[PDB]
Amino acid sequence: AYTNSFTRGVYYPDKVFRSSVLHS
Amino acid sequence: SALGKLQDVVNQNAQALNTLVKQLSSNFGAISSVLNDILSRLDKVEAEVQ
Amino acid sequence: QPTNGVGYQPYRVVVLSFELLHAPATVCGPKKSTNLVKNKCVNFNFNGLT
Amino acid sequence: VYAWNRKRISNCVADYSVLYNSASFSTFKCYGVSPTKLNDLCFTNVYAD
Ligand SMILES: *[C@@H]1O[C@H](CO)[C@@H](O)[C@H](O)[C@H]1NC(C)=O
């Protein structure tokens, strides 16, 4: 069987604090 | 939507300064873009080339 | 054989590979730490970040 | 050398001058760092291959 993941599985990519920002 | 001519001039000046600040993070082929990394890791002769 | 010419004698080799990541440190030099001076303009070093 | 030993070094303090001041070493080339600066630095990990 299969299922749609939607938006899931995002994680913090590095141990750096960032706020009020869009980062690529 | 009518005042787009004035907001366009603000947006171009904002994009020019954001491009100028983002280019500080570029390496240009150096060991780091952080000038303090180079100066804390290398001696005069090797640092000055980076 | 111990009678080999110098380029054919054995040499012991070590490569000390260093990494500092977007992360804490775990290995450091022998340098002394000192007290934290807030609110003044200060020169600083945290874990080699000058 | 086909099966080299990686000795991981972590959670400790290192005086690299104990190494680089010794006349016992025939070569001590460094890349991206200088021996003089190693006593001023810190690292996440070190691997002695
Ligand atoms: C993807 O999962 C859905 C839901 O189970 C299924 O209908 C679809 O055929 C699957 N497609 C592929 C290529 O796996």
Side-chain angles (χ1 to χ4, degrees):
Chain A
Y2 296 94
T3 285
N4 196 315
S5 65
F6 305 132
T7 56
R8 294 188 165 286
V10 190
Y11 62 89
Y12 293 84
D14 54 10
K15 307 188 180 185
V16 183
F17 179 83
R18 300 188 187 85
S19 64
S20 300
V21 70
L22 309 183
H23 180 66
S24 180
Chain B
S1 57
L3 267 73
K5 285 184 176 178
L6 305 184
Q7 187 64 66
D8 182 12
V9 172
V10 175
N11 289 357
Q12 287 182 48
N13 279 273
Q15 282 195 327
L17 289 177
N18 278 275
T19 307
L20 187 68
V21 176
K22 282 179 177 180
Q23 283 289 70
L24 287 166
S25 73
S26 299
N27 285 347
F28 307 109
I31 271 164
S32 180
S33 58
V34 185
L35 192 74
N36 267 275
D37 288 349
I38 300 169
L39 292 167
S40 61
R41 288 165 53 175
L42 301 175
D43 288 317
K44 294 181 293 179
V45 181
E46 297 300 329
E48 289 178 358
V49 174
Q50 303 301 306
Chain C
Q1 289 272 31
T3 197
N4 281 8
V6 68
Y8 292 93
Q9 290 167 23
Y11 277 59
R12 281 173 183 218
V13 182
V14 180
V15 182
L16 301 183
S17 309
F18 302 135
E19 64 183 5
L20 183 281
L21 304 178
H22 303 291
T26 79
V27 182
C28 285
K31 203 165 192 163
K32 289 185 177 181
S33 56
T34 197
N35 189 31
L36 172 61
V37 185
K38 292 173 179 172
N39 308 299
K40 301 190 188 182
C41 172
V42 295
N43 169 261
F44 65 74
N45 177 339
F46 297 92
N47 307 339
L49 178 75
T50 56
Chain D
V1 67
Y2 82 90
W4 48 274
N5 278 132
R6 173 159 284 186
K7 177 61 163 183
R8 170 179 159 80
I9 299 292
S10 72
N11 313 89
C12 63
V13 286
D15 178 2
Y16 295 89
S17 76
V18 176
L19 313 179
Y20 63 74
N21 291 339
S22 186
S24 64
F25 301 113
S26 309
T27 280
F28 212 104
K29 284 287 184 180
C30 302
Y31 306 87
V33 288
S34 182
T36 55
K37 266 60 181 170
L38 302 181
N39 281 0
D40 294 300
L41 291 170
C42 296
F43 310 103
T44 300
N45 306 301
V46 180
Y47 311 113
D49 302 338

